């Protein structure tokens, strides 16, 4: 009845946007301090990963009633190593 979802483009669009938003939601969701609706809030504010990581704690706290502490947690995971441990920040560790 509705002339939409008729082309292959619709499918490409729908699944791409869905996957996109899913990954973005999930990525922000990786923070234990962030809940699923919290990620949603970062999505309505920046809706993009680059915009999240380019956003500082203050920008993440700027986000509508979301969480200044959440911002602190987000920024932390954004700039912390996966190995948790660095080779040497102020004190040089074993490097290997």
């Amino acid at each position: 009845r509705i002339r939409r979802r008729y082309n292959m483009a619709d499918l490409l669009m729908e699944k791409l946007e869905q996957d996109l938003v899913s990954r973005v939601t999930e990525c922000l969701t990786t923070v234990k301090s962030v809940n699923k609706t919290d990620s949603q809030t970062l999505l309505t504010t920046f809706g993009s990963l680059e915009q999240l990581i380019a956003a500082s704690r203050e920008d993440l706290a700027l986000c509508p009633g979301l969480g200044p502490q959440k911002a602190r947690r987000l920024f932390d995971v954004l700039h912390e190593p996966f190995l948790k441990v660095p080779g040497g920040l102020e004190h040089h560790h074993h490097h290997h």
């Binding site: 791409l16 990786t30 680059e50 996966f82 190995l83």
Partner: protein, 84 residues
Amino acid sequence: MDSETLPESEKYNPGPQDFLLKMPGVNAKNCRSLMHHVKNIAELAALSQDELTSILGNAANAKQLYDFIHTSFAEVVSKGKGKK
């Protein structure tokens, strides 16, 4: 990875690794390469296509990842403006 006989398993930060593990096109192969050359997702997102492609080893994977970082679901949900 330390002069200890212990594996790095205790020393992984769940948040940032998971952030990378949730990225599209990024399988464990790519994840390991990234944690070897790259400190954090910030370096990753600061990387150019070629840079991340060399680390990932796969051009296709790299495209998925790179494009994602630089794109939005908003584009795809409603294309009003944009050259792509």
